[PDB]
RNA sequence: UUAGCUAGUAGGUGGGGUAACGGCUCACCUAGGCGACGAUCCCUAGCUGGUCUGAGAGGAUGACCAGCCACACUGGAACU
RNA sequence: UACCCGCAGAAGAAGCACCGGCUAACUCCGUGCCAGCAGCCGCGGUAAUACGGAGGGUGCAAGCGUUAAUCGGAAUUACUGGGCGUAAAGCGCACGCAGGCGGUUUGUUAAGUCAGAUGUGAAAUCCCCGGGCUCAACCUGGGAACUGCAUCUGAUACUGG
């Protein structure tokens, strides 16, 4: 079905994830429906590192989109941050 | 303070009973760096006599061009025999981007920022001839105002 | 919301069908001249009320035959 | 045949001007009269008149300055063989604004400057400097 | 000239005809030496220029220059050829790559060695 | 990747002192400064228009210790940047760390300063920077790190520095062996017998 | 240095058919339909975002990344 | 692993093409229309800066040259932006269908043309200002751009009906 997950861009040894809503069958870095956040695991954390349009994430869940283990974590982490 | 530039030197030849007589030609431009440009062309058996005859010609036979803060008023086309010539007022910082023959003319003229290009024959004597006349026929925001009989914003 | 085309009837021979030509001017992509282009459409004319030469208003609809995806809305001018 | 009378108008101006003629005259037309209006209003000619009712002859009084023709160049742009239309944001300017382009709009014939200021595009009839 | 005319018959750029068709847009080609000989050049020059006829892996058979002073090439020598005409030798449109395959380097070269397939001399 | 050969040859070919030695000596007592290198140095070059453009670009490159590829890329960036390209080229050169290290007097030459940089003797903002072409920014503080502070090269380097004209846009504390890149140098800060527009001309044709 | 092409052909009625409109299919009827605004035939070719070049307009191009299509030894076929 | 500290010693780390004009860089010796060079012109028969070696020099540099290949310069297919008396180019001449173009006035229409609004023009790429790897390549935030298409509503001077 439709799922919200991380498409891994960035460079070798320097991962950078683009959070995307997509048909789960399409390849990880392939066709998606909507971009909805990003996630830098290598951010200096002096400034940002994790940004989620929670309004559109929820909208898609409301219509049955599932959510990665890793995005489900980010959302709990970001909800905690503020 | 007048600026003078040697554009091209060339060997021509004349034939007589005894054989070929070789001589030289010199094409130069003088300018005041502030809107005045002359070109000269001299002939002589030795090169120095030729480069010198030309400057002499270049000093008189000099004309004025209505510059605009070191750049042109509007794009201009020039033509003479083989050479079609084209020039544009560029913004500040660019400098003169142009062929050798034209650069020398524009430099000594005081045209600080321009886009130029020569089409057809790049024969130096006719290229410079075509540039000078282009700059010379180049009219000014004030003369068009005078012509049209109105000192509107366009003045 | 009534998208529509206007053109003239080049053939009325078929039973309940018609051929309509839509002509327009178009700027030439390279040389700038404005060129006539024509689009011929097989259109449905139940009742065959459209005569050749007529000027008619047509609309797009579902497939009616291998080549008909348009039907008649109404006649505009006729019998020049 | 006489399939572009506007080029004809431009040219009669250009040639009589080159021939240091005091005036030029041509069969009239609203469209010529609309262009003559712009020329006069922008000071490229003195004045103009149309005379007669059934076969109107239009007359343009040319203009000279330093024993020179005020009209330096005058060229047809759009033409029967190749119509040229421009949008407001695409309107050419002649001599970096020193000259003018005559433009025909939904609100009648005016200069590039005018049409620009009035948010319009149109058929580019000619350039004049 | 007319717009109308161009609208009926567009501007049509001429397609460039190549000067080394036997290469078929390859940087070199391999081939067997069919004949290995000398030939004299065109006005105003004069010499005995070393050339070879070479049947290439793609069937083409061409004449190719053997530059440098001295070469040990014969029939059935397998060589590598590259583009490059010999101007005073009409017909000759390729050069042999000295020091590749069966073609040896020029003997005793010190300057421009790499254009003649010559190793750097121990020194 | 670095020019390693004789240095005064370069000065001799360009017709000027390129500061490739400390300055302890009048350069004319170390070489025939006013004569090109080689058998035909005495010969005069009746030098083409292309020639003068080439030599001027070489001159600047040889001053800063930059090879062609990097220097061309410097031109490209100067061009892309806003404002006069010629001046932008010199800002970029003058912002190099090996250069700045030299101007604060930590190195007798840009070559020596570069070695200081490469050999992890220089810090920027208390952080070790060891690549010569590191672009230094306004308000940065470059310093000799503690362990490199007792190197006698550095003391000598600061002495000579005190005898050169003192650059405006740098605040140097000789005691601490730290210094501050206050601002980008203006054009007027840099020598006036550099002809950038020639270099600009060479790279536009 | 290809000018004519077309019998399921173009349309109509009705039955059948598909997940669904449809000559998709069949019978009957009408004689149409396409074409110099290039049909038919012949040669070549996956298309695009874009890539390279060029001041631009253009020219050339369609590896790597992404979107669509097509194929899975060759030709054909359906089953789930 | 990145990165940080320590040890040993300049220690293990420089080649390639070019130097007649175009084109930055010149001399000697050898050869003698030979051997050979050659992107174009063109070098070689006794002083060859053009062949080959040397010394010297110029340009690049972990590359440097040669070949192949696209565009550029090429206004040399010219829409922007060319030509046809003698340079390549007016059909030997006329009539004429299709086609292109069409004098002047009014009204009408509103397809061309013009304006506005709305939707769409995937992301990446390009560009701008920032952020992150010691810098850079590279990665990345936001923007701008996608100059296009379509629908609706208007304007009516010019073109078309
Ligand atoms: Mg020419
Ligand atoms: Mg490198
Ligand atoms: Mg049925
Ligand atoms: Mg194929
Ligand atoms: Mg793959
Ligand atoms: Mg692969
Ligand atoms: Mg793909
Ligand atoms: Mg199969
Ligand atoms: Mg030289
Ligand atoms: Mg050579
Ligand atoms: Mg000799
Ligand atoms: Mg090539
Ligand atoms: Mg071209
Ligand atoms: Mg021509
Ligand atoms: Mg005659
Ligand atoms: Mg002829
Ligand atoms: Mg005739
Ligand atoms: Mg009305
Ligand atoms: Mg940074
Ligand atoms: Mg980005
Ligand atoms: Mg963005
Ligand atoms: Mg996009
Ligand atoms: Mg009308």
Short mmCIF file of N, CA and C (backbone and C1' of nucleotides) in Angstrom, two decimals, chain E residues 68 98 105-106 108-119 121, chain H residues 16-19 37-38 51-54 65-66:
data_model
loop_
_atom_site.label_atom_id
_atom_site.label_comp_id
_atom_site.label_asym_id
_atom_site.label_seq_id
_atom_site.Cartn_x
_atom_site.Cartn_y
_atom_site.Cartn_z
N UNK E 68 58.92 7.45 -38.38
CA UNK E 68 60.15 7.21 -37.64
C UNK E 68 61.25 6.73 -38.56
N UNK E 98 53.66 3.25 -33.68
CA UNK E 98 54.93 2.62 -33.34
C UNK E 98 54.90 2.08 -31.91
N UNK E 105 59.28 0.04 -31.37
CA UNK E 105 59.52 1.45 -31.19
C UNK E 105 60.63 1.86 -32.12
N UNK E 106 60.84 3.17 -32.27
CA UNK E 106 61.95 3.65 -33.05
C UNK E 106 63.20 3.42 -32.22
N UNK E 108 66.64 4.08 -30.58
CA UNK E 108 67.57 5.12 -30.12
C UNK E 108 66.99 6.54 -30.01
N UNK E 109 65.67 6.68 -30.08
CA UNK E 109 65.02 7.97 -29.89
C UNK E 109 65.19 8.49 -28.47
N UNK E 110 65.34 9.81 -28.35
CA UNK E 110 65.52 10.45 -27.05
C UNK E 110 64.51 11.56 -26.87
N UNK E 111 64.18 12.23 -27.97
CA UNK E 111 63.18 13.30 -27.96
C UNK E 111 61.88 12.84 -28.63
N UNK E 112 60.76 13.21 -28.03
CA UNK E 112 59.44 12.85 -28.53
C UNK E 112 59.21 11.35 -28.52
N UNK E 113 59.83 10.65 -27.58
CA UNK E 113 59.81 9.19 -27.57
C UNK E 113 58.41 8.60 -27.62
N UNK E 114 57.47 9.22 -26.91
CA UNK E 114 56.15 8.61 -26.76
C UNK E 114 55.39 8.60 -28.08
N UNK E 115 55.79 9.44 -29.02
CA UNK E 115 55.19 9.41 -30.35
C UNK E 115 55.84 8.34 -31.23
N UNK E 116 56.82 7.61 -30.68
CA UNK E 116 57.52 6.59 -31.46
C UNK E 116 57.74 5.30 -30.66
N UNK E 117 57.00 5.16 -29.56
CA UNK E 117 56.88 3.89 -28.87
C UNK E 117 58.17 3.47 -28.20
N UNK E 118 58.89 4.44 -27.65
CA UNK E 118 60.22 4.22 -27.10
C UNK E 118 60.25 4.39 -25.58
N UNK E 119 60.64 3.33 -24.87
CA UNK E 119 60.73 3.38 -23.42
C UNK E 119 61.74 4.43 -22.97
N UNK E 121 65.01 5.59 -21.52
CA UNK E 121 66.29 4.90 -21.36
C UNK E 121 66.84 5.01 -19.97
P C H 16 59.30 10.84 -19.70
"O5'" C H 16 58.01 11.68 -20.12
"C5'" C H 16 56.88 11.03 -20.69
"C4'" C H 16 55.90 12.03 -21.24
"C3'" C H 16 56.40 12.89 -22.39
"O3'" C H 16 56.36 12.22 -23.63
"C1'" C H 16 55.28 14.26 -20.83
P A H 17 57.30 12.72 -24.83
"O5'" A H 17 56.62 14.07 -25.33
"C5'" A H 17 55.41 14.02 -26.06
"C4'" A H 17 54.86 15.40 -26.28
"C3'" A H 17 55.80 16.37 -26.98
"O3'" A H 17 55.87 16.19 -28.37
"C1'" A H 17 54.89 17.42 -25.09
P C H 18 57.19 16.65 -29.16
"O5'" C H 18 57.08 18.23 -29.17
"C5'" C H 18 55.92 18.91 -29.63
"C4'" C H 18 55.92 20.35 -29.17
"C3'" C H 18 57.09 21.21 -29.61
"O3'" C H 18 56.90 21.73 -30.91
"C1'" C H 18 56.75 21.49 -27.31
P C H 19 58.15 21.98 -31.88
"O5'" C H 19 58.85 23.26 -31.27
"C5'" C H 19 58.26 24.53 -31.43
"C4'" C H 19 59.07 25.61 -30.75
"C3'" C H 19 60.51 25.77 -31.21
"O3'" C H 19 60.62 26.49 -32.42
"C1'" C H 19 60.47 25.78 -28.88
P C H 37 58.88 10.79 -40.53
"O5'" C H 37 58.91 12.32 -40.16
"C5'" C H 37 59.23 12.75 -38.85
"C4'" C H 37 59.14 14.25 -38.75
"C3'" C H 37 57.75 14.84 -38.81
"O3'" C H 37 57.08 14.77 -37.58
"C1'" C H 37 59.18 16.05 -40.24
P A H 38 55.56 14.26 -37.56
"O5'" A H 38 54.83 15.37 -38.42
"C5'" A H 38 54.72 16.69 -37.92
"C4'" A H 38 54.16 17.62 -38.95
"C3'" A H 38 52.83 17.22 -39.55
"O3'" A H 38 51.76 17.63 -38.71
"C1'" A H 38 54.32 17.82 -41.28
P C H 51 62.00 19.26 -36.82
"O5'" C H 51 62.62 17.94 -37.45
"C5'" C H 51 61.92 17.19 -38.44
"C4'" C H 51 62.82 16.15 -39.07
"C3'" C H 51 63.72 15.40 -38.09
"O3'" C H 51 63.09 14.23 -37.60
"C1'" C H 51 65.02 16.25 -39.88
P G H 52 62.71 14.12 -36.05
"O5'" G H 52 64.06 13.64 -35.36
"C5'" G H 52 64.56 12.35 -35.63
"C4'" G H 52 66.03 12.22 -35.32
"C3'" G H 52 66.49 12.77 -33.99
"O3'" G H 52 66.17 11.93 -32.90
"C1'" G H 52 68.01 13.41 -35.67
P G H 53 66.03 12.58 -31.45
"O5'" G H 53 67.53 12.88 -31.03
"C5'" G H 53 68.37 11.84 -30.57
"C4'" G H 53 69.77 12.33 -30.30
"C3'" G H 53 69.92 13.34 -29.17
"O3'" G H 53 69.91 12.76 -27.89
"C1'" G H 53 71.12 14.09 -31.04
P A H 54 69.41 13.64 -26.65
"O5'" A H 54 70.49 14.79 -26.55
"C5'" A H 54 71.74 14.54 -25.94
"C4'" A H 54 72.68 15.69 -26.13
"C3'" A H 54 72.42 16.92 -25.28
"O3'" A H 54 72.94 16.80 -23.97
"C1'" A H 54 72.72 17.58 -27.52
P G H 65 50.53 18.51 -22.99
"O5'" G H 65 51.11 17.46 -24.02
"C5'" G H 65 50.46 17.22 -25.24
"C4'" G H 65 51.09 16.06 -25.94
"C3'" G H 65 50.29 15.47 -27.08
"O3'" G H 65 50.49 16.19 -28.27
"C1'" G H 65 50.99 13.74 -25.65
P U H 66 49.27 16.45 -29.26
"O5'" U H 66 49.04 15.02 -29.89
"C5'" U H 66 50.02 14.47 -30.75
"C4'" U H 66 49.63 13.08 -31.16
"C3'" U H 66 48.24 12.94 -31.75
"O3'" U H 66 48.17 13.30 -33.11
"C1'" U H 66 48.55 11.28 -30.13
#
